[PDB]
């Protein structure tokens, strides 16, 4: 009611008018007046304990292993940037695209090949998170990136 | 087989025209004409025009006979009001309503 464009004038006298007492027309009781406890810009973030997100990252990867849904690859053979290159590879690995896959690799070429597949989230090892792991049905990592995950939960 | 007419936005007060429409409902066209001709009411002029118009529609468009026409149904709905300012004493403005009527007349064929 104080950030609103109206004047702070009393619209009519306090008494003897036969109407309700009022102040200015920015009071939230008026149409077009202020909003009482509406939102203001907020910072929804909070420092979740490091140990807790370290454990959750470890636990989320454990979950996919406990269902036999995690796959380590040594390298991505004929995948030099082209989508149909990565698909061809995905065939010879049993990743036919009926399951959501999180592709975790430092290989810029391989991520670029798979980014457009609707069933593929792509990720660098530095960004292994639990939302994306849980978002997806199976996990796929560089042995280079598996080293990076083994560090971050040590 | 029926024939209708509607005079919309006649600048007259519905309550006033209804009195006139009440004289003619269920009358033949000949009786409704004679009645309307000697009714001492502004609203009769407006009703006559709707009556005759509907009758022309009956004869011209719907293959009905002028000799068998009667007012099977007739009613006055209210339309948007014209709001005007009437000045009063001690500086007050009254808001006069110059009301509006949609006038409908429906004619059938009275067989026999």
């Amino acid at each position: 009611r104080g950030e609103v464009a109206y004047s702070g004038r009393k619209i009519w006298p306090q008494k003897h008018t036969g109407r309700a007492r009022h102040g200015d027309i920015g009071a939230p009781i008026f149409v077009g007046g202020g909003v009482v406890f509406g939102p203001k810009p907020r910072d929804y973030s909070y420092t979740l304990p490091k140990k807790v997100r370290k454990k959750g990252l470890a636990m989320a990867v454990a979950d996919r292993a406990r269902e036999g849904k995690l796959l380590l690859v040594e390298a991505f053979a004929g995948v030099n940037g082209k989508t149909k290159e990565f698909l061809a590879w995905a065939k010879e690995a049993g990743l036919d695209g009926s399951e959501s896959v999180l592709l975790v690799t430092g290989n810029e070429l391989v991520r670029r090949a798979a980014r457009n597949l609707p069933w593929v989230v792509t990720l660098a090892p530095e960004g292994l998170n639990v939302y994306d792991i849980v978002r997806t049905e199976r996990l796929v990592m560089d042995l280079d990136a598996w080293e990076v995950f083994q560090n971050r939960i040590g | 087989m029926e024939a209708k007419a509607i005079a919309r936005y006649v600048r007259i007060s519905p309550r006033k025209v209804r009195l006139v429409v009440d004289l003619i409902r269920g009358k033949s066209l000949e009786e409704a004409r004679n009645i309307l001709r000697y009714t001492n009411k502004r609203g009769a002029y407006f009703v006559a025009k709707v009556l005759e118009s509907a009758a022309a529609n009956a004869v011209n468009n719907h293959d009905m006979l002028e000799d068998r026409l009667y007012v099977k149904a007739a009613y006055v709905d209210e339309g948007p009001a014209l709001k005007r300012v009437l000045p009063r004493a001690r500086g007050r403005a009254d808001i006069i309503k110059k009301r509006t009527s949609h006038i409908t007349v429906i004619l059938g064929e009275k067989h026999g």
């Binding site: 009519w12 006298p13 003897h16 008018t17 036969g18 | 001690r90 500086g91 007050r92 403005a93």
Partner: peptide, 14 residues
């Protein structure tokens, strides 16, 4: 109606 007619004075109940 920015002009309000002032109310009549009350009957003096003293």
């Amino acid at each position: 109606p920015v002009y309000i007619p002032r109310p009549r004075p009350p009957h003096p109940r003293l």
